[PDB]
Amino acid sequence: APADRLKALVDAAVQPVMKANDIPGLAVAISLKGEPHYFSYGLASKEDGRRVTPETLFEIGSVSKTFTATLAGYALTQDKMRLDDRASQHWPALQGSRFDGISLLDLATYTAGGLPLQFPDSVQKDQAQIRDYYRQWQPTYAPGSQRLYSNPSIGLFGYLAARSLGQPFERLMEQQVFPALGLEQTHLDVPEAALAQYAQGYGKDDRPLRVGPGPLDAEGYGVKTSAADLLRFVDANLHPERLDRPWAQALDATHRGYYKVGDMTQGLGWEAYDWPISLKRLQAGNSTPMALQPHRIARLPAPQALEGQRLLNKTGSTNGFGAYVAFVPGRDLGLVILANRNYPNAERVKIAYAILSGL
Ligand SMILES: *C(=O)N1C[C@H](NOS(=O)(=O)O)CC[C@H]1C(N)=O
Numbered sequence: 001a002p003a004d005r006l007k008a009l010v011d012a013a014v015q016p017v018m019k020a021n022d023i024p025g026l027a028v029a030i031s032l033k034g035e036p037h038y039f040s041y042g043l044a045s046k047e048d049g050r051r052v053t054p055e056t057l058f059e060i061g062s063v064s065k066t067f068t069a070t071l072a073g074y075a076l077t078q079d080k081m082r083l084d085d086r087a088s089q090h091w092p093a094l095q096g097s098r099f100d101g102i103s104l105l106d107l108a109t110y111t112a113g114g115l116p117l118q119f120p121d122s123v124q125k126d127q128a129q130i131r132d133y134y135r136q137w138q139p140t141y142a143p144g145s146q147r148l149y150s151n152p153s154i155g156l157f158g159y160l161a162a163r164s165l166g167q168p169f170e171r172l173m174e175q176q177v178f179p180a181l182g183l184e185q186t187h188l189d190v191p192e193a194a195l196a197q198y199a200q201g202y203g204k205d206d207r208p209l210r211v212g213p214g215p216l217d218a219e220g221y222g223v224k225t226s227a228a229d230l231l232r233f234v235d236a237n238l239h240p241e242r243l244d245r246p247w248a249q250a251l252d253a254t255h256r257g258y259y260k261v262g263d264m265t266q267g268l269g270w271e272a273y274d275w276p277i278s279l280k281r282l283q284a285g286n287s288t289p290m291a292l293q294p295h296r297i298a299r300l301p302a303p304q305a306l307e308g309q310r311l312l313n314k315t316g317s318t319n320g321f322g323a324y325v326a327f328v329p330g331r332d333l334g335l336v337i338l339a340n341r342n343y344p345n346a347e348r349v350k351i352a353y354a355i356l357s358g359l
Contacts, residue, residue, distance in 0.1 A: 006030075010039045013354035014337075018042065021343035023322075024202055025052040027227035028351075031235050031327075031334035032359055038227060044199035044340065046206070054228040055185060057198045058338040059211055060323040061316030062151075063230075064223040066254065067186075068158035069269030071169070071177050072108065073253030077246050080164040083108070090160040097135045106143045107157040109258055109266050111297060113139025114146070115153040125213045133215075146294040147261055154269075155216030170218045180247045181236055185229040188218050198224065199340045201320015209320030221318065227336050234327050234334035237312070255312070255329070257304040259297035261290070266297075267306050275311040275328055279353045283346045286315055311356070317342045324348035326356065333359055 010028055018026055018041060025042040038054040075081050081090065083105040088094035090104075098113075106112040115137070123129045134156065162169035170188050178186050190198055201209040211222070225233075236243060240251035257265035257272055264285040265272040273282060284290075306312055306329070313326040322342045327334035337351055 006032075006037060007039065009358040010355055013351045013358075014039065014041060017343075017347050017351050018339075021339075021341060021347055023339045023341045023343055025056070025199060026337065026339040027052050027054060027056060027058065028355075029054060029227040029231035029336040030355065030359070031231055031238065031332070033332065036228070036231055036235075040227075044197075046200070046202070050199075052199065052340075055197055055226045056338075057185070057187070057190060057194065057224045057226055058323060058340060059201060059221075059318045059321040060223050060225060060230065060325075060338065061211075061221045061318045061321060063314045063316035063323045063325055064219070064221050065154050065316075066269035066314050066325070067173065067177065067223055067233075068154060068161075068169075068219045069108065069254045069267075070181075070250050071165075071172060072104075072157060072161040072268060073250035074177065074246065075161045075164045076253055077249040078165070081161060087156065087160060090163045093131050094134060098138055099134060102139075102143045104157060104160060105258065107153050107160070108268050110147045110150050110153050111144050111259075112150075112153050113141050113143045114148050114294065115150040115156075116148075117150055117292065119152050119155075119215045123215050125215045125217065130215050141294075144299075145296065147259075147266065147297050148294045149291050151220040152216065155219045158219030159216060173218070180243065182232055183225070183229045186223060186225040186233075188222050188224075190224050197226070199321075201318065202341050203319055209318070211318045211320070221316065227338050230325060230336045230338065231334060234325060234336060238327055238329060238332055238334055255306040257300060257306050259299045261295045261297060264290075265300075265304060265306065267312070270306060270312040270314060272306040273311045273313070275309050275330075277311070279350065282311070282313075282353060283349045286313070286345045286349050288345075313352075315345045315348065317345075322348060324352055326352050328356065 028039040030037045087099040240248040308330040316323045
């Protein structure tokens with residue numbers, strides 16, 4: 001039986017990785033041939049016995065950047081900004097700073113010249129502190145040359161895209177983006193009425209960990225969502241034509257590659273690979289040196305469509321959570337894996353590869 005085989009395949013991929021990484025709870029959602037399939041494992045909260053379901057809310061961390069990218073794709077379809085705009089076009093406080101010579105594309109794709117992984121601990125979630133950080137920042141190397149994965153970089157991209165639309169980022173997400181995408185279980189600021197769905201996150205010694213405030217957190221890493229809503233988002237990415245045209249175009253803008261580093265082609269939010277490709281290679285593209293070290297880019301002569309025989313993915317983590325999303329445009333296949341422990345990206349990719357190989 002097909003439901004027995006699919007359950008066996010997903011269980012075989014998930015169960016050992018959960019044990020091995022001591023993951024309390026994990027939700028899988030798969031889109032296959034136009035149909036959704038959900039597999040829920042373990043506990044959302046150990047202390048109260050609450051089980052994971054497809055409606056449990058997880059922190060997705062940097063997977064949030066794919067939503068940020070979608071907002072920016074909406075601003076672009078509306079002609080409120082262009083990728084080649086200088087960042088300081090969209091924020092007068094930045095005029096006269098080094099952001100006069102940095103494009104929005106450079107910010108979105110981590111090539112502004114060495115913006116760091118995180119804001120320094122000296123910058124708190126405070127508009128003035130953020131402003132002053134960017135005013136004073138100077139590149140380590142020429143913009144457009146080297147990829148250094150960076151929350152302040154894409155954070156500023158999303159902040160400027162929201163400025164270009166004339167409204168705060170978080171308001172635009174709640175009022176316009178999430179409703180356009182059909183997402184009612186997707187939040188930047190979880191409502192009190194939805195808190196009972198919010199899983200606990202677990203760290204060292206099972207310390208409980210839910211993400212706290214930080215500068216440009218919404219734009220970099222602040223979405224909480226369920227496996228079912230995140231799979232709805234993947235299905236919108238698999239079929240943008242099913243949305244009203246401005247939002248189809250906003251999604252398409254996230255399916256354009258600008259350069260390569262190793263096996264990976266960098267889009268807005270999404271990172272792409274040829275498919276098939278080995279597990280080792282997909283793990284290496286999602287490895288610690290990719291998150292932490294600069295890499296010289298191989299720029300494409302024109303943007304490349306991230307479609308067909310490709311896998312598009314994004315990892316994300318918070319202190320307490322570990323998420324992974326992947327889909328294969330040319331096969332109508334999508335997958336979401338959400339967990340309440342931050343466990344290594346290689347292990348997330350191991351689960352996903354086993355599932356996608358078996359589908
Ligand atoms: C993304 O979740 N954040 C940014 C950065 N990206 O790397 S990732 O998804 O390989 O995990 C480091 C992890 C994470 C964060 N802000 O800690």
